[PDB]
């Protein structure tokens, strides 16, 4: 029970993930997750938000399980680079998670971290989105050690299977038999009003996962339908004599289209990924023009926080004439996300950005928001840093997920469900 407390004061992945073009800059952003920078010493989870003025940091004492998933997968990659401290940390982190209060097995959003333990936020909110995300994270973590005869790694495996098994009540809880979709979650003891009803958003992993972990329960098996029946909408544009048909995220925000791609090889599993390629190029053009990064939910330049999307890449605007987010600001993590679609142009772009704005670099990472005029946030966010770094690791995290799904009999289910991912 009494153990030494390791300090991760160095964090490095394998060499293959660092572009020749861009090594240092990835390390800088990766360094966010060093102990004492972006990671809390007492709970050993990343802070939700930092403020950095001159390599001195202020901290918002919150976290969520999406930030923790990404942290985990990164740790795995540091472990593969040969960091033995990371393997200890992965076990400390699983303990935390096992200790975190839950609701029918599902994690809360957010977790308050003020005490030195995870308290559920005042809402008592239990979202499908965060539990979907973390389900795949743990798959990838298990995916990475399933071949190990090391008994410590075997241990991690069994602990992850347990923790996912425990979520069965939660997932069953969330299955509306009438609408045939997942409710969005639980909030203060009550089902949340809305449903997981669009493939083109973050919450799709939950819908993907529920059928899998409940596959065996026979009569009460949650149907694939919870994923398949979800709607997918594009819009058909033309530009300088070329057609684009971009997949529309609800609020136009990049992250909803490409976050899941950190865990799943969506570029192969989707029949025609062209829509994603198109959403990407349109984002890439709007970015280049406004001399700022691509656009997703992020910090503001004055340290608020706001969804940000391109109106013409937004379902709500295009489809329902309801504009719910601006394209005033860009964020580095959205440009880095795009390395999962086009890695050459992503590095060019981020490099282009740092040439224009040399002050964007801090020792905790690049700042989260950059205006078209060149104004900038003081905030750096664990969510965005995890997405930034994870984009570059996705090939390795994707392979591990697939290994997991193959071992658990899930892989054909996933592929089948992906057959449905096509423009309605």
Author numbering: 20 to 443
Passage from the reporting paper:
β‐1,2‐Glucans are natural glucose polymers produced by bacteria and play important physiological roles, including as symbiotic or pathogenic factors and in osmoregulation.
In this study, we used PgSGL1, PgSGL2 from Photobacterium gaetbulicola and EeSGL1 from Endozoicomonas elysicola as Group 1 proteins; SkSGL from Sanguibacter keddieii, a Gram‐positive bacterium, as a Group 2 protein; PgSGL3 and PgSGL4 from P. gaetbulicola as Groups 3 and 4 proteins, respectively. Groups 1 and 3 contained proteins from many marine bacteria, for example, isolated from marine sediment and mudflat environments. Because hydrolytic activities toward β‐1,2‐glucans were detected for PgSGL1, PgSGL2, PgSGL3, EeSGL1, SkSGLc, and XcSGL, the general properties of these enzymes were investigated using β‐1,2‐glucan alditols (see Section 4 for details) as substrates. All the enzymes were found to be endolytic enzymes, as is CpSGL.
